[PDB]
Symmetry: D3
Subunit: 151 residues, 6 copies
């Protein structure tokens, strides 16, 4: 299940804030593997289809707006239990609740300014990933050490 | 209400131990604003009122001595729920119980050499701040990050 | 003139080395804006095209080779003097003369496995980008600290 | 009681992972004195002896196995409460429940490849050392900041 | 003569940019002793005398403005050839020319946003120190590290 | 020549200072491989045979003395050109001359308090290594990536 994959976006702040590598490096060092990845400017349109569930939801409005407001880091990571796991590294959605050593616990404060999103699960993963990527953008390759990360 | 402030000092142990740059580094990193700070040797007087409610603690004159046994770094940091948050960053009063990822957590073993203090509550913060600093010393300014951290 | 660009690429071994957020960090922290970024497999055509000046020399398709055996992180970083400075950051072309502080002087040992590549002139630069990115991938945005980095 | 000891070992994958100075760092920065350290190949006898409590369970010689396929960094770290605290630093035994801040929560994903090991009682502790080090390898010295770490 | 001191301030750019903890962190790291430090907004008066010899520089009122455009961190650090050394750590006046590994080096692009100042010479240090600090503010103490850093 | 090996000792200060991992991690991340390694207390005797050339040399006297004065990190590293290379990472013997990004440039100040030694060359390597180690202490094994470090 080591081929599990999750979608991680470093949000507009993430980006202005200068936490790009930092974040990426946490995943790298934990042992997961970047499958896909590009720097973009989510479309309004996308943000809307991405954020559709939670559409008619106050916040909404301006989520897109800010989400749209800047370039983000679209990323796909691979590994055993990344969805779960990446969600921990992340921290709680509201930074108020995240803790030290997590991503958001360490560098952010407030919810509307969350620095990053991770899929909430495989079902999600799939959708977003599908929704965010093109088949080709995904890249098959193997580690220099699948052996020391997994048995 | 992103004006809440907190008092934080860095014990002699922190100082002697070289932990400034890192302590500071974590608050700069999470996003809070340094409103004042100086590096001094606090007086027994100062310590004694700072540590007033613990005057009936046997530790109490131990603290007071060691807390005056070398330079310390006083500071006020501000931001939204910066008093709770800071605490959490801090670790727990007893290092024994502070989670890795917390200052206390990676850096200190014991209660009496627990390198740092941060306010316990906003009233306490008002106090200590008043105690430690002249209002003048506190720097009123705006953050570049400002809009990126805050909604 | 804060507009100059450079093309940075993370060679397939630096990715394999879990050196991406690390090097991406060096950039960001130096002050550079990220224009465009992608993770991917370089094609033989692109690569050939890319290494064209040296189509004869020995090392050649051993280049193309390696160069196409894994993913790279392809990037475009902006800023005053990106191209010469980038350079100086990567350090020299053969790791061994690379100096402690540079990417290469810090992480890699031999010329043939030298984690990354940066355009060596704007000239090259201009070409490198042209070749590697569609234009719809250059991102147009203003930084948080434009006016902290520049006079 | 600042004398308690613990036995830490860097499993052959964490070495393979270039995680040694990293984890050694976590210790040192937390405040612990290093009593004894060695790099080496664990023998089958030692290892068998070492994993004795579990000679039956499945995972068993797959332990012994891995465990003898590479070098480990064998260490003894001193200090108040090394053994429980060490623990809390490594994080849980299965990486996935390991938390961001711990060695395991930061660097590793699966139980079977979990970078390191620490004695889980002083009891174990005492045995672990006894087994792994000759006595002529425990180093007797006083720290620079004995009296900054301890009351 | 391990008493030599130097003045170092951290520009508004450094401050706004979050580089305190790191700047401090490098001096704590190399081994020098922080003798005083405060965080203030310097006055044009202050800046103007500080920057006196450059009063005939066109940059001069640019500096003066920006140097007063936000809080700064003044400090005196001491140790053996701390004035030359510090400089070297610093980087070069022009970031363009400062070697990776230097503060200037990893962190700043341009001459007018070059985040930091450190004394050019001991006479200059005496001056600036006098300028910036009241003698009282400077902390006289001894280092734990003391004998470890010094013969 | 990728089997070249050099002797690196983290000196008594190195040790009290808490730079153990740090240093080790520079070698790890640069790509070299630890062949041998133990924490010890050099004998006077050893220090004498080690430091014999430069015997009847003022300094001498007390070099042993301090060298002897504390436990050190005996280490053996492997890689292409480690002798040379490790010597750069190191910095100049006198820290006064080392630069930022080097080991000693970054963390030490004065010569008698040098934090570490590296062999000055293959001839040296051999001798010290021989002199410091027992055949068995050396450990043959191969990387999880000799492939991405060397071609
Ligand atoms: N202002 C605001 N933003 C929210 C709230 N709940 C969720 N969001 C955002 O909605 C995002 C959707 O999931 P994310 O993982 O992207 O992180 C979430 C938050 O940034 C809320 O109550 N207020
Ligand atoms: N020696 C000692 N100091 C204590 C004890 N409990 C609290 N402290 C010290 O006194 C403190 C009061 O506030 P702090 O926030 O600084 O953190 C605690 C330590 O500095 C105790 O039981 N023993
Ligand atoms: N194997 C090998 N690769 C080389 C040699 N010189 C340059 N290169 C490689 O080819 C690359 C061309 O420029 P890079 O910036 O990509 O840095 C160079 C190295 O990857 C050489 O002598 N041998
Ligand atoms: N493969 C595998 N290894 C396990 C299991 N549980 C514990 N271990 C390993 O055996 C080790 C015994 O204690 P460690 O501290 O060394 O941590 C444990 C892991 O390396 C399991 O279910 N599977
Ligand atoms: N804009 C500008 N500032 C300069 C120039 N030369 C020096 N400086 C600034 O003025 C400085 C004088 O001392 P500093 O040490 O702070 O570093 C230099 C920068 O802050 C220049 O040519 N242009
Ligand atoms: N005090 C002092 N120590 C020195 C001098 N020259 C060399 N040493 C030490 O001699 C050591 C021998 O080589 P090292 O690589 O171990 O690093 C050297 C220095 O620590 C000198 O002129 N004075």
């Amino acid at each position: 299940a080591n081929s599990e994959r999750t979608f991680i976006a470093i949000k507009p702040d993430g980006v202005q804030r200068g936490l790009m590598g930092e974040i990426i490096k946490r995943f790298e060092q934990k042992g997961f593997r970047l499958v896909a990845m590009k720097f973009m400017r989510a479309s309004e349109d996308l943000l809307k289809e991405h954020y559709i569930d939670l559409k008619d939801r106050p916040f909404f409005a301006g989520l897109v707006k800010y989400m749209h407001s800047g370039p983000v880091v679209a990323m796909v990571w691979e590994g055993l239990n990344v969805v779960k796991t990446g969600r921990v590294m992340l921290g709680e959605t509201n930074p108020a609740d995240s803790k030290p050593g997590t991503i958001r616990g360490d560098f952010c404060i407030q919810v509307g300014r969350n620095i990053i999103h991770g899929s909430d699960s495989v079902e999600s993963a799939e959708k977003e990933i599908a929704l965010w990527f093109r088949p080709e953008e995904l890249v098959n390759y193997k580690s220099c050490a699948q052996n020391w990360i997994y048995e």
